[PDB]
Amino acid sequence: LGGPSVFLFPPKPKDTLMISRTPEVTCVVVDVSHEDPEVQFKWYVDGVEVHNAKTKPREEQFNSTFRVVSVLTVLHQDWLNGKEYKCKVSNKALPAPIEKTISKTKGQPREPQVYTLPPSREEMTKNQVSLTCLVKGFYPSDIAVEWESSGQPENNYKTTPPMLDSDGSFFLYSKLTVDKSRWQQGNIFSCSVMHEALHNRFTQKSLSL
Amino acid sequence: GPSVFLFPPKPKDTLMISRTPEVTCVVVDVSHEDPEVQFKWYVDGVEVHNAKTKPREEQFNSTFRVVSVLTVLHQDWLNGKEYKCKVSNKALPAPIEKTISKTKGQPREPQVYTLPPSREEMTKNQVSLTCLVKGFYPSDIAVEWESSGQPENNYKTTPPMLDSDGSFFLYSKLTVDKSRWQQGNIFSCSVMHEALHNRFTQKSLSLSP
Ligand SMILES: *[C@@H]1O[C@H](CO)[C@@H](O[C@@H]2O[C@H](CO)[C@@H](O[C@@H]3O[C@H](CO)[C@@H](O)[C@H](O)[C@@H]3O)[C@H](O)[C@H]2NC(C)=O)[C@H](O)[C@H]1NC(C)=O
Ligand SMILES: *[C@@H]1O[C@H](CO)[C@@H](O[C@@H]2O[C@H](CO)[C@@H](O[C@@H]3O[C@H](CO)[C@@H](O)[C@H](O)[C@@H]3O)[C@H](O)[C@H]2NC(C)=O)[C@H](O)[C@H]1NC(C)=O
Numbered sequence: 001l002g003g004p005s006v007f008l009f010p011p012k013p014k015d016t017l018m019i020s021r022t023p024e025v026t027c028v029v030v031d032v033s034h035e036d037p038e039v040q041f042k043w044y045v046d047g048v049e050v051h052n053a054k055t056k057p058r059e060e061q062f063n064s065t066f067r068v069v070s071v072l073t074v075l076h077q078d079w080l081n082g083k084e085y086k087c088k089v090s091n092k093a094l095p096a097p098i099e100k101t102i103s104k105t106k107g108q109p110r111e112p113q114v115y116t117l118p119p120s121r122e123e124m125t126k127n128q129v130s131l132t133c134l135v136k137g138f139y140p141s142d143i144a145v146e147w148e149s150s151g152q153p154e155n156n157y158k159t160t161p162p163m164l165d166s167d168g169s170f171f172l173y174s175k176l177t178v179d180k181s182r183w184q185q186g187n188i189f190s191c192s193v194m195h196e197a198l199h200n201r202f203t204q205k206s207l208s209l
Numbered sequence: 210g211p212s213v214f215l216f217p218p219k220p221k222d223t224l225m226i227s228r229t230p231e232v233t234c235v236v237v238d239v240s241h242e243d244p245e246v247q248f249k250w251y252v253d254g255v256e257v258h259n260a261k262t263k264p265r266e267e268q269f270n271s272t273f274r275v276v277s278v279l280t281v282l283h284q285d286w287l288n289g290k291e292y293k294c295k296v297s298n299k300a301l302p303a304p305i306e307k308t309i310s311k312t313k314g315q316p317r318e319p320q321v322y323t324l325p326p327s328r329e330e331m332t333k334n335q336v337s338l339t340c341l342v343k344g345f346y347p348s349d350i351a352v353e354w355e356s357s358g359q360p361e362n363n364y365k366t367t368p369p370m371l372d373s374d375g376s377f378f379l380y381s382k383l384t385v386d387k388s389r390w391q392q393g394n395i396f397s398c399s400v401m402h403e404a405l406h407n408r409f410t411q412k413s414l415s416l417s418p
Contacts, residue, residue: 092392109407115329117339120322130341132324134382160367160380173380 003093004031004039008085009099013142016079016104017194017201023079024071025102027053027087028091033064036092041070044086045078079104080196101186105140109197112138115157116191116207119183128177131207133191136171138162147176149187154178210360211238211246213408215292215307220349223286224401224408230286231278231307234260239273240344248277252285252291257393269274286311287403316404317376319345323414326390335384338414340398343378345369354383361385376390383391390416 006071007030010025029039043053056069072085114137119129132180135145141162147154162170174191188208194201215239218230236246250260260279268274279292292308319342325340342352348369354361363384369377381398395415401408 001212113330113333115327115337117324120324120341123320123322126320130322130343132339132341132380134327134337134339136337136382156373158370158372158378162369163365163367165365166363166384171365171382173339173382175343175378175380177373 002031002095003095004029004033004089004098006030006100007087007097008087008094008102009164010102011074011079012085014144014194016076017196019076022073023076024073025085025087027070027072027089027100029068029089030065030093032068032091033093034066037066037068038091039068039070040088040090040097042088042090043072044088046083047086082106100205101208105142107139107168108175110137111197112136112143112193112195112203112209114203114205115191116189116205118198118207118209122181125158127180129180129183131176131178131183131189133174133175133176133193133205133207135191135193136165137167137169138171138195138197139169140196141170142171143170143195145174146192147174148192149189154189175188211236211240211296211298213237213242213294213296213305213307215309217311218281218286218307221329221351221401222284223349224351224403226283227279230283231280232280232292232294234277234296234307236275236296236298237268237272238273239298240300241271241273243378244273244275245298246275247297248301249295249297250277251295253290254293268279270281289313312349314375315348317344317346319343319350319400319402319410319411321398322397322399323412325414325416331387334387336387336390337409338385338390338396338412340381340382340383340400340412340414341378342398342400343372344376344405345378345402346376347403348377349403350379352379352381353399354381355399356396361396393417 007028007041009026015021015023027119053072086101090097115134117132145159159174160172190206192204214235216233222228222230263276266274293308297304321339322341323341342413354364367379399411
């Protein structure tokens with residue numbers, strides 16, 4: 001019955017911030033038919049057509065439709081400087097082509113402030129205690145947070161999604177749970193944050209009794 | 210054709226004596242040709258007849274929204290009774306049925322901890338007071354920061370997040386002028402939840418060497 005639908009995805013945050021990763025924008029076409037699987041993708045960067053996108057392997061979904069996907073590698077600095085990426089999709093089951101445009105969220109970046117907070121004394125009655133990392137004042141909301149100890153990632157932590165604050169920046173908390181004895185024995189735990197507005201896109205704060 | 214949504218009561222409505230909780234059966238995209246909607250309601254399988262239909266509302270897109278509300282007893286909802294709405298309309302080939310109840314699972318009492326601002330935050334104009342609320346089930350909860358009985362103007366509370374033990378946690382961040390912390394004013398984090406004694410608890414935070 002219904003024709004295809006198009007969704008355009010930004011790079012993953014870590015891909016935009018890590019030297020070792022390659023960020024890409026992903027143009028996804030769903031509900032493509034078996035009678036007309038062919039999809040034309042045209043790509044534009046700030047309105048200028050580009051030709052280095054690549055089509056991923058066509059994929060039949062469990063519901064017997066085709067998913068057709070084009071990916072365009074982006075330069076780290078291009079994405080972070082706010083370039084606009086446009087995908088134009090044509091298919092014979094569409095009456096007209098579909099255009100979508102994506103870019104990094106607009107707004108002046110702001111550096112996260114990272115504060116480690118020890119467990120409350122009242123939590124010391126429990127088997128495990130909570131080590132809290134408050135990350136606030138950041139913009140845009142794309143960010144990565146990890147808790148580590150002795151250079152290894154901790155097994156049991158959860159990070160809230162960024163939440164808009166009253167000044168137009170974002171904040172989050174990351175809660176690390178550890179056995180009480182590991183806190184009491186004086187081990188050092190570290191909260192690591194990646195964000196475009198940090199120096200070298202990275203900072204780390206440590207916490208210990 | 211029309212679509213049917215069934216909403217539970219507001220969390221505060223379920224926990225406050227002074228409030229009346231209700232379940233709301235919402236029918237959208239009702240036509241002008243056949244605005245008539247029949248509602249049947251059932252409580253644990255047993256038809257009831259004390260629901261009320263809200264005033265019909267034409268929406269900005271020129272469709273009708275038709276809503277039936279059924280009042281629920283505080284104890285009935287917390288004891289997990291199940292509420293079914295059956296909807297009939299000429300533009301439906303078959304009636305639509307929807308059931309809703311308190312989320313299944315044994316309740317667990319929130320643990321509430323207040324965490325003072327980091328010393329590293331003391332060069333800022335304003336400091337962050339943190340309320341960690343963890344280990345609670347189900348996720349329905351309300352949180353508020355106060356001082357001298359009056360609610361605070363500038364706090365934000367994260368949505369509940371599922372933790373690794375199947376309970377929820379959240380943080381509530383209160384922002385105050387540094388001078389109000391430095392001068393020893395007392396702030397309080399108040400939490401309402403079904404598994405608290407009297408459905409309420411309060412924890413204070415202040416600078417007090
Ligand atoms: C057949 O199966 C595929 C795979 O499950 C379905 O594809 C999915 O289609 C929905 C839209 O109908 C897409 O939802 C979109 O997701 C994005 C990302 O969260 C969101 O931004 C959009 O607002 C929207 O929710 C979903 O991405 C897509 N999943 C995949 C893997 O491509 C397809 O709809 C099914 N077709 C039929 C007729 O059932
Ligand atoms: C015409 O305007 C009305 C009112 O703006 C639109 O009603 C909305 O319809 C959508 C689904 O079509 C409803 O979304 C649902 O919301 C619930 C709770 O947020 C969610 O659980 C569901 O999965 C879904 O997202 C939405 O509740 C409803 N809004 C209101 C005020 O009733 C309607 O869609 C428009 N109809 C047409 C033909 O344009």
